[PDB]
Design a protein around this ligand. Structure first.
Ligand SMILES: Nc1ncnc2c1ncn2[C@@H]1O[C@H](COP(=O)(O)OP(=O)(O)O)[C@@H](O)[C@H]1O
Ligand SMILES: Nc1ncnc2c1ncn2[C@@H]1O[C@H](COP(=O)(O)OP(=O)(O)O)[C@@H](O)[C@H]1O
Ligand SMILES: [Mg+2]
Lengths: 269, 1722
């Protein structure tokens, strides 16, 4: 980013993200039928789209349970936002997975992220990210956890859901190179999975304890090994004042400017 | 005739206050025009003072009244004009107008007008007692207000009267300025503050308002002053209470018009003085410049300045007023460099080299400003900008004449007062950001700055020089000589003025609007100069009164307000209706174009980016434009702002936006134009942004109300949130703040750190302590919540706010404001919000707020409860309220349908004798009754009938009663109501319905066990209240009269829900248990209001669903129209006051000609509201509309009255009812109302229950009331409200009944939900539990834990627990869930009961009652009470202790605390016999101690607390006796005997050491002197008296002597005989038996005579034995005798058998019958 002009164009843009919110598409494609099927409550989806930005990927972590007596469907009941920052093609979020009390009741279902340009494939950066989570986390089950990619289409939003195949998981555990075309990448690595939106139940948010989630505007304050706690509260928007301290901390001024126009007229209170 | 629309644009005056209505002017005498090249110059000489009139002298400060003289010190004589009008000032309330030139000293005239009022309230032994009056001083300028409060304070301080500026934000400082008198303010301040209502708490305490510099009428600001005064006058006409008005003006024509406006009688009230009365004569110089080109002009004026200044360069003083900030010093240095360019000519401003103190100007060298350059020479500069103190240091320098040239600004003339020999006004033109352009300065600005010309002391005559543009040269002559008309700019503002008056409710319709405008200055000006104001003389003749013009006028305003949605007004009715948008508009003084711009622009989804733009679009900024030259800087500023403007390019929107940001971001601006502009924008921004917040909050859109309140704070504090909150404490160093901002360490993480750990972060440890102070000074709340579901739709929330911060009134001040708002799942919608305000006193006191919130079909994971400070930035606490475990109640089945039946005639019951008590009242039973009839009458089974109050269920009960009547001659029936008032109300009816007509005896239960027992069993129908029927019937196993009852009736069973509900529940349950054991069925009939859960109640009380009738509130004999009126004012006084007018209107609307009842929160409020109804009754031009008979008819009724105001209120048809009224007064008022004589009655809330007179319309006013105990207001209990509502029923006549409920904003939705729906009812037994288990264990109804659980299953609690488990904190709906719950319950109840030693728990299974519990159960006393007793009473306790111990009793915490009872009880406690140890005066235990001592000292108090005293006394004796029992059981002689003594002292109302004779009636204290001097010390002494000296002692009166004789007969004459059985044979451990034998020769008749006691009582006696030497109670017994007794008591012999003891004998009532006999055994 240009860090001056680049900030503002996208900033007055994102104030319209809520317009997208009511036009969304969902990939319908061939159902494995032996697979799990994930239901995403619409409210969290709306809010998640609304906090995002149209260039930097933001990501969120999925937490849910399967409804009683129906083990093959996973309701996503919660999204957790952790300290993070994006690129246009990927997202850097820390090594620690969410730990918190409200979360103990549910299982992790993977993660969801915004995707500035729509691609009909799981980006190598993703399969690599996911495998590398999975390597370090037994908590995440290969077969149960997914990557939901939410892409910004014109005036719209459109989303797909992927699972790593074991081929993919091994490649990704192995993979170093984060470029858009790493060696040995294959369409054999991922698999699409069945997902539905729902108005039947409401999902909720988990959000960083002492800060907010969006570190894009401080990259030096973000570290892979950084630790965080959580709370029950909603995410602030991308360009929210808090995510942007450096800019509100731009004041170089001498007080005596106030000497000029010392006619104080007030008369009201 | 129909109105016509007109254009208000061409009808106003542009360039107001520069108007110059006259196009012709005048010379003064010696004046001449001399025109030079490029400039005309006009000269007028000084005026000639009017020669002193024949025998006219000045008045010294001696010869005017004694009191006022104080505070005039330093001043020996009065000014000529002051001396002229002082007489009318202090001797008359007649309104004043003075017109006198600047310098005449007008203030000190008005001061006197104040010293009169200050004198109107005075006392001998105290002076100027200050709560009677407040004065309002309106001054035109801010500096002037400041300095005025400054000097007024000093001056009036001798009186000790507190005068302050009103700069207050409304809410924090109201309660601050409450105690403030003579408050000074700008007209505007007064107008907003009146529009909000901050004034309406002040007014009617205002006898005086000063309008200072009232010629401001001519300014654009004029309409404000016009709005003030108009309101004041128009208001006085309604209230009939008057006010003095004192106008002060510069000398100008139109004086008589301003006189008419102020309602000043021209005869005695008008005062005029021309320009000759200026104390320092003024020679006027005016140079107008003809040059068109400004470029040449900015030379010419420079040169005129130079020549004029060199003219005075000799010994003299010049002062230059420039209208620029910077040019104060740009004008100087021009004069300097010119004098240097003059070859050192003009220099030597002194008498020599060293002379005239050039070392004064040189030695003052180093200073803050640019002065260091100018000061070495002859001149300097002054203004607010460059320095603070050096301004005062320059003023000191000018007064002492060390500087003869000073260039400055208008704020110097308006601020601290110093004159100059000659002053020179450069240019007269200023920059108006409001107007967007340059304009000539105002009238008052020149008048003020040129009225500074010449000194009062060091000067002979003053001159002044106005350098202006030739075109305006005429204008400035019409001013400074009196040629100028004062005209009103009112038309421009007319739409905004009208709104705010509708907003205050002062104008309902078009007519009231024309009436209002008839009070305007513009009205008298339109009358006396129509030619100027747009009225041709012919159509003026056609409408002389201007009725049709004032109707046309205001019609356009009405249309403008309608089109912008401030008002909904249809042309047909002519009526206005206010909208919330309108109110917001008025309250923020924002124009009606801006507000509609906000209405259309503002949407829920707005970003900050957009919020700013919408702000920028405010119509208030319409004239602001962007100049080419500044567009260079604006761009830079545009890239240095945090919030993107980029939506807009360079246009006004951008300029305004970037400006606001610049101000918040704290940025200095190079251009002057931009600076002034920015100032305008930011000053208006507070009100603007705030009105946005208010709007967007009322809508409920969460996110944007956050963004907007935060913006508000950011404007107020001048910073972004991203900056450290510590900055709002200005006390802090900047570098330290910046240092803590350097490292990012989140602020809320500062609380964990101590003083050292703080300093370690920024490595500045020296600061470590101070920082800490601030961190804990920063307002912090912690909050807890208790949540329980009410219905599937609604949850109840109890929020507990606990202050976490250290209060300092030099920071937090008198009050701190917080918004609590509960937001929905996404923090999207605000489900509810309240304004919570924590006062100074109550920091550290946890406040409890209770409110309900809705829930919706996809039950959400949680709500959020947010709390945020109003003014404080970055100060917030959020509380997730999680529903993850919530279990919603079962949805409630539909109410049983009201069948369509042939309405049942009274001819149904075949009994004629029954028909008789109905037929002559009503022809037919209502559908409810007729549907219940066959079930309740022709059939024997238990029924439940719910129908909303007013449905006639009483006679439904009477049906069942009649059935029982047929069933058996002697058939027995018990009837219960939860309200004692309602009980008496039932008894009065049923006694005539049954005992009178049907011969069947009817009774009403009372306090005493004995009398009550005797009562039932003689009666067929027993009417009682739950407590009376608990104590009796707990023991039911022994009392056959309890068991044999045929019918049992519970009325208002929904009352189970409320407190004192558990007792009701427990007695119905018990009733069922009895019917279980008696083997005979006992029919139960229960009556409730509409109940959603009626099924449970029925199932509990054993009604089959087929006999259950639960009806919807929409089924009522007489339909009800319910209306709810929300009021957004949280402060209760203001709210209550501002619903006064709506009350009257509610009558005139809903029930103009029909009976009306008004319920009020306060005992006293009833009077006040009756008054206000009458005073606003006059307004309507309609007097005594509520009186339906002539005054001659009311006289027989009014003869019976004490209350004097009640006579008045009744005379006009109102009247009131409350606690203090004599029962005769009340009966009378009720009679007058029901008979139809008076149409309206205002009644205390307490009387809602026991009131036997109904109405057509009922208006509930303000549903909260005041509780002294927690010092807060608390809502009316819902059932109460429903009862008040049910009080509008008139089935005999009306086809409808009406109710209006005026309540707070918060409480609106709650009523909207729960008044219409049937009500849910839950059990409270779980909380109030111990007492009953104890009592029941005592009866051996609970023999062991199992019996306890079983007992639980008979209750309503048992029923409800599984229905709505989350309410009872039961976590599951399962079997073992409920089972485990009840188990844990009896477990802890029995444990807590065993800990208290009321029971013993054996093996862990069985239970038995112990001593304590036995007592408790016997006297019906709370268990904690007698536990307290158990740990309190000791061996050495005596009456001093017994007073406080018996006071702390639980039954005495029901005693409440009223408005300001903290001073009252202190004043009483001062004078009582026993003082207390640091007592809190809001505590009811303390209050009952003091009331009790008061009763013992026979002190007569107010009837208010006297009622209270009587209630305490009612239950006192029981407690006392319980103490006797605890003490005797514990084995202590002295305290026991003393307690019996206390019983006696309470009975006869006297202290322990006192005359025993004072028990006799008509016996004074002065009687005791001669009685004791005679030698007669007791009643046994006056027994022997024959009829010779008996009445011949002191006073002889046959009636009183007989009244004493009956007492003497009734006084106990009792002879005992005591022996020890087999005295000579006694062994250790052996039984000792002492037999006592009582007899009485006194005639046995009647009860104890003790007139000072509310209860009738019998003679109780204790026969005690004890060894008095060891303070040991050896034995005891209790008895009631009546003419014969035999009482034997025994104990266990100690030691060897050679011993001696004491026999005692004692009463509970009479003093002095106590008998001791010391005896020896062996
Ligand atoms: N009796 C007096 N003795 C001394 N000074 C006086 C007296 N009466 C008035 N003044 C002077 O008059 C000035 C008051 O100005 P005034 O004409 O009251 O202004 P305003 O327009 O506010 O009424 C004060 O500076 C005061 O010094
Ligand atoms: N059949 C009837 N026709 C007209 N009015 C009735 C009838 N029955 C009762 N009322 C009126 O209803 C009032 C009491 O209403 P009710 O519902 O019985 O009291 P509650 O609600 O306390 O049980 C009485 O004042 C009586 O005048
Ligand atoms: Mg009743």
């Amino acid at each position: 980013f240009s860090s001056k002009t680049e900030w503002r164009v996208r900033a007055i843009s994102a104030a319209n993200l809520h317009l997208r919110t009511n036009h969304i598409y969902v990939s319908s494609d061939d159902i494995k039928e032996t697979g799990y099927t994930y239901i995403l409550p619409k409210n969290v989806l709306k809010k998640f789209i609304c906090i995002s930005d149209l260039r930097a990927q933001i990501a969120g972590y999925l937490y849910g349970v399967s409804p009683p007596d129906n083990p093959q469907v996973k309701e996503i009941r919660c999204i957790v936002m952790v300290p993070q920052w994006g690129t246009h093609q990927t997202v850097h979020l820390p090594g620690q997975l969410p730990q918190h009390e409200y979360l103990k009741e549910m299982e992790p279902l993977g993660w969801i992220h915004t995707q500035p340009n729509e691609s009909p494939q799981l980006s190598p950066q993703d399969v690599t990210t996911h495998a590398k989570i999975m390597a370090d986390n037994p908590s995440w089950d290969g077969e149960k956890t997914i990557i939901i990619t939410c892409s910004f289409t014109p005036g719209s939003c459109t989303l797909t859901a992927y699972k790593l195949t074991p081929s993919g998981y091994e490649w990704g555990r192995q993979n170093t190179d984060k470029g858009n075309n790493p060696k040995g990448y294959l369409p054999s690595h991922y698999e699409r999975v069945q997902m539905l939106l729902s108005d039947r139940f409401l999902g909720f948010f988990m959000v960083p304890a002492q800060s907010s989630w969006n570190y894009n505007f401080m990259g030096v304050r973000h570290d892979p090994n950084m630790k965080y706690e959580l709370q029950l509260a909603n995410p602030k928007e991308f360009y929210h004042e808090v995510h942007r301290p450096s800019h509100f901390l731009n004041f170089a001024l001498l007080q005596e400017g106030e000497v000029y126009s010392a006619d104080r007229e007030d008369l009201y209170a | 005739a129909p109105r016509q629309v007109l254009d208000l644009e061409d009808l106003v005056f542009t360039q107001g206050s520069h108007f110059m209505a006259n196009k012709r002017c005048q010379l003064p005498d010696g004046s001449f025009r001399r025109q030079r090249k490029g400039y005309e110059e006009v000269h007028v000489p000084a005026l000639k003072p009017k020669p002193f009139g024949s025998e006219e002298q000045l008045l010294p400060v001696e010869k005017l009244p004694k009191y006022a003289q104080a505070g005039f010190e330093g001043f020996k004589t009065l000014n000529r004009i002051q001396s002229k009008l002082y007489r009318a000032a202090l001797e008359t309330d007649e309104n004043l107008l003075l017109c006198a030139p600047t310098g005449a000293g007008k203030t000190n005239v008005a001061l006197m007008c104040m010293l009169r009022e200050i004198g109107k309230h005075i006392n001998m032994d105290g002076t100027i007692n200050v709560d009677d009056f407040k004065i309002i001083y309106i001054a035109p300028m801010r500096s002037l207000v400041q300095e005025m409060v400054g000097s007024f304070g000093k001056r009036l301080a001798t009186y000790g009267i507190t005068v302050a500026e009103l700069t207050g934000d409304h809410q924090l400082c109201k309660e601050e300025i409450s105690a403030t008198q003579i408050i000074v303010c700008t007209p505007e301040k007064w107008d907003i503050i009146t529009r909000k209502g901050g004034e309406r708490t002040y007014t009617q305490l205002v006898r005086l308002i000063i309008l200072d510099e009232i010629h401001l009428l001519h300014d654009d600001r004029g309409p404000v002053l016009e709005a003030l005064v108009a309101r004041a006058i128009r208001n006085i006409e309604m209230t009939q209470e008057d006010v003095r008005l004192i106008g002060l003006s510069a000398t100008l024509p139109n004086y008589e018009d301003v006189a008419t406006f102020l309602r000043v009688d021209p005869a005695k009230g008008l005062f005029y003085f021309d320009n000759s009365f200026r104390p320092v004569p003024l020679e006027q110089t005016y140079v107008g410049i003809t040059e068109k080109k400004a470029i040449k002009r900015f030379q010419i004026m420079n040169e005129i300045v130079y020549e004029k200044i060199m003219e005075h360069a000799g010994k003299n003083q010049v002062l230059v007023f420039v209208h620029s900030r910077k040019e104060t010093g740009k004008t100087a240095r021009a004069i300097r460099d010119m004098c240097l360019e003059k070859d050192t000519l003009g220099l030597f401003l002194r008498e020599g080299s060293a002379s005239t103190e050039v070392l004064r100007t040189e030695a003052e060298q180093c200073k803050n400003l640019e002065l260091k350059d100018l000061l070495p020479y002859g001149f300097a500069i002054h203004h607010a900008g460059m320095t603070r103190v050096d301004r005062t240091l320059v003023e000191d320098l000018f007064a002492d004449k060390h500087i003869q040239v000073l260039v400055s600004t208008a704020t110097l003339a308006w601020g601290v007062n110093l004159p100059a020999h000659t002053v020179i006004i450069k240019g007269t033109q200023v920059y108006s950001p409001e107007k967007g352009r340059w304009t000539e300065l105002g009238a008052l600005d020149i008048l003020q700055m040129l009225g500074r010309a010449g000194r009062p002391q060091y000067d002979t005559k003053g001159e002044g020089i106005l350098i202006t543009s030739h075109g305006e040269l005429q204008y400035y002559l019409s001013l400074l000589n009196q040629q100028l008309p004062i005209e009103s700019q009112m038309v421009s503002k007319l739409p905004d003025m009208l709104n705010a008056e509708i907003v205050l409710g002062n104008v309902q319709n078009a007519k009231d609007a024309v009436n209002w405008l008839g009070y305007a200055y513009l009205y008298i000006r339109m009358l006396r100069s129509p030619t100027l104001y747009g009225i041709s003389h012919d159509d003026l003749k056609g409408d002389p009164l201007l009725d049709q013009r004032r109707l046309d006028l205001v019609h356009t305003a009405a249309l403008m307000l309608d089109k912008n949605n401030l008002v909904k007004y249809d042309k047909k009715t002519g009526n206005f209706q206010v909208t919330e948008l309108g109110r917001i508009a008025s309250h923020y003084y924002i124009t009606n174009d801006t507000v509609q711009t906000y209405n259309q622009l503002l949407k829920p989804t707005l970003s900050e980016i957009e919020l700013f733009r919408v702000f920028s679009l405010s119509s208030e900024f319409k004239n602001i434009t962007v100049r080419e030259e500044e567009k260079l800087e604006l761009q830079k500023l545009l890239e240095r702002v945090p919030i993107p403007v980029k939506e807009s390019i360079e246009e006004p929107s951008a300029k305004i936006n970037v400006l606001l940001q610049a101000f918040i971001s704290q940025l200095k601006l190079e251009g002057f134009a931009l600076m002034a502009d920015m100032v305008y924008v930011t000053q208006s921004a507070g009100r603007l942004m705030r009105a946005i917040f208010e709007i967007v909050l009322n809508r409920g859109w969460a996110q944007l109300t956050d963004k907007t309140l935060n913006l508000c704070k950011m404007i107020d504090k001048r910073m972004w949130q991203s900056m450290c909150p510590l900055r709002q404490f200005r006390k802090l160093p900047e570098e330290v703040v910046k240092k803590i901002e350097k490292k990012n360490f989140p602020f809320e993480r500062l609380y964990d750190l101590n003083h050292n750990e703080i300093g370690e972060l920024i490595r500045m440890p020296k600061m470590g302590k101070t920082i800490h102070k601030y961190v804990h000074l920063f307002p912090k709340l912690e909050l807890s919540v208790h949540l329980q579901p009410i219905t599937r739709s609604t949850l109840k929330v109890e929020l507990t706010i606990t202050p976490d911060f250290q209060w300092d009134e030099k920071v937090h001040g008198s009050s701190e404001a917080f918004w609590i708002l509960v937001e929905d799942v996404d923090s999207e919608v605000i489900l509810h919000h309240e304004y919570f305000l924590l006062k100074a006193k109550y920091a550290q006191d946890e406040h409890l707020i209770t409110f309900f919130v809705p829930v919706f079909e996809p039950l959400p994971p949680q709500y959020f409860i947010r709390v945020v400070s109003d003014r404080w930035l970055s100060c917030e606490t959020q509380l997730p309220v999680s529903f993850r475990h919530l279990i919603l109640p079962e949805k409630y089945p539909p109410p049983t349908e009201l069948l369509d039946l042939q309405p049942l005639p009274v001819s149904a019951l075949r009994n004629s004798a029954f028909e008789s008590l109905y037929q002559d009242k009503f022809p037919f039973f209502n559908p409810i009754q007729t549907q219940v009839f066959n079930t309740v009458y022709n059939s024997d089974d238990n029924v439940f009938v719910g129908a909303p109050t007013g449905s006639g269920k009483t006679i439904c009960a009477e049906f069942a009663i009649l059935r029982m009547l047929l069933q058996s001659s002697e058939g027995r029936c018990v009837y219960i109501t939860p309200m004692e008032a309602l009980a008496e109300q039932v008894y009065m009816d049923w006694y005539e319905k049954f005992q009178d007509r049907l011969n069947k005896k009817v009774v009403l239960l009372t306090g005493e066990t004995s009398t009550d027992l005797k009562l039932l069993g003689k009666g067929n129908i027993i009417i009682s209240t739950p407590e009376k029927w608990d104590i009796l019937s707990r023991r039911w196993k022994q009392r056959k009269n309890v068991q044999n009852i045929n019918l049992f009736v519970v009325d208002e069973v929904h009352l189970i829900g409320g407190e004192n509900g558990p007792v009701l529940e427990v007695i119905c349950s018990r009733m069922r248990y009895i019917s279980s054991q008696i083997e005979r069925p006992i029919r139960i009939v229960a009556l409730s209001s509409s109940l959603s859960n009626a099924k449970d109640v029925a199932h509990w009380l054993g009604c089959s669903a087929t006999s259950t009738f639960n009806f919807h509130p929409n089924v009522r004999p007489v339909p009800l129209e319910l209306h709810i009126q929300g009021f957004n004012i949280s402060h209760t006084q203001t709210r209550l006051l501002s619903m006064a007018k709506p009350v009257y209107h509610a009558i005139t609307k809903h029930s103009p000609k029909k009976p009306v009842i008004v319920f009020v929160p306060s005992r006293k409020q009833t009077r006040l509201t009756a008054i206000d109804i009458l005073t606003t009754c006059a307004a309507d031009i309609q007097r005594q509309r509520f009186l339906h008979c002539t005054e001659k008819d009311l006289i027989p009724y009014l003869e019976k009255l004490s209350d004097s105001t009640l006579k008045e209120t009744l005379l006009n048809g109102v009247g009131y009812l409350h606690e203090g009224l004599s029962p005769m007064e009340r009966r009378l008022v009720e009679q007058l109302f029901s008979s139809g004589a008076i149409q309206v009655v205002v009644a205390s809330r307490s009387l809602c229950w026991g009131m036997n007179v109904a109405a057509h319309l009922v208006i509930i006013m303000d549903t909260q009331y005041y509780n002294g105990k927690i010092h807060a207001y608390v809502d009316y209990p819902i059932y109460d409200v429903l009862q008040m509502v049910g009080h509008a029923n008139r089935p005999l006549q009306d086809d409808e009944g009406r109710c209006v409920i005026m309540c707070q904003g918060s409480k609106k939705d709650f009523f909207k939900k729960f008044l219409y729906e049937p009500l849910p009812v839950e059990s409270h037994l779980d909380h109030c539990m111990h007492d009953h288990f104890n009592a029941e264990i005592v009866t051996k109804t609970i023999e062991n834990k199992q019996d306890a659980v079983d007992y639980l299953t008979w209750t309503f609690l048992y029923r409800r627990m599984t229905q709505n488990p989350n309410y009872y904190n039961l976590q599951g709906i399962s079997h073992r869930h409920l089972s485990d719950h009840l188990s844990e319950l009896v477990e802890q109840t029995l444990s807590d009961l065993e800990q208290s030693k009321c029971i013993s728990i054996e093996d862990e299974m069985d239970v038995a009652p112990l001593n304590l519990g036995m007592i408790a159960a016997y006297y019906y006393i709370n268990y904690t009470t007698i536990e307290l007793f158990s740990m309190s009473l000791n061996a050495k306790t005596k009456v001093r202790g017994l007073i406080e111990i018996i006071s702390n009793a639980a039954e005495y915490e029901n005693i409440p605390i009223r408005h300001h009872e903290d001073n009252l009880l202190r004043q009483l406690a001062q004078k009582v016999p026993h003082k207390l140890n640091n007592p809190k005066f809001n505590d009811p235990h303390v209050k009952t101690n003091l009331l009790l001592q008061a009763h013992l000292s026979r002190m007569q108090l107010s009837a208010e607390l006297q009622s209270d005293t009587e209630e305490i006394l009612s239950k006192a004796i029981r407690l006392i006796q319980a103490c006797v029992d605890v003490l005797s059981s514990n084995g202590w002689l002295s305290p026991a005997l003393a307690a019996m003594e206390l019983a006696q002292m309470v009975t006869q109302a006297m202290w322990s050491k006192d005359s025993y004779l004072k028990q006799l009636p008509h016996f004074t204290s002065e009687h005791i002197k001669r009685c004791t001097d005679k030698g007669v010390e007791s009643v046994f002494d006056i027994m022997e008296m024959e009829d010779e000296e008996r009445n011949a002692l002191l006073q002889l009166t046959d009636s009183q002597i007989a009244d004493v004789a009956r007492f003497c007969n009734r006084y106990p004459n009792i002879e005992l005989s005591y022996e020890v059985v087999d005295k000579d044979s006694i062994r250790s451990g052996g039984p000792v038996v002492v037999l006592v034998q009582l007899e009485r020769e006194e005639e046995v008749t009647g009860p104890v005579i003790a007139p000072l006691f509310p209860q009738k009582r019998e003679e109780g006696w204790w026969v005690v034995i004890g060894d008095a030497k060891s303070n040991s109670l050896i034995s005891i017994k209790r008895l009631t005798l009546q003419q014969k007794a035999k009482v034997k008591l025994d104990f266990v012999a100690p030691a060897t058998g050679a011993h001696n003891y004491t026999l005692y004998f004692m009463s509970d009532a009479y003093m002095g019958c106590d008998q001791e006999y010391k005896f020896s055994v062996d």
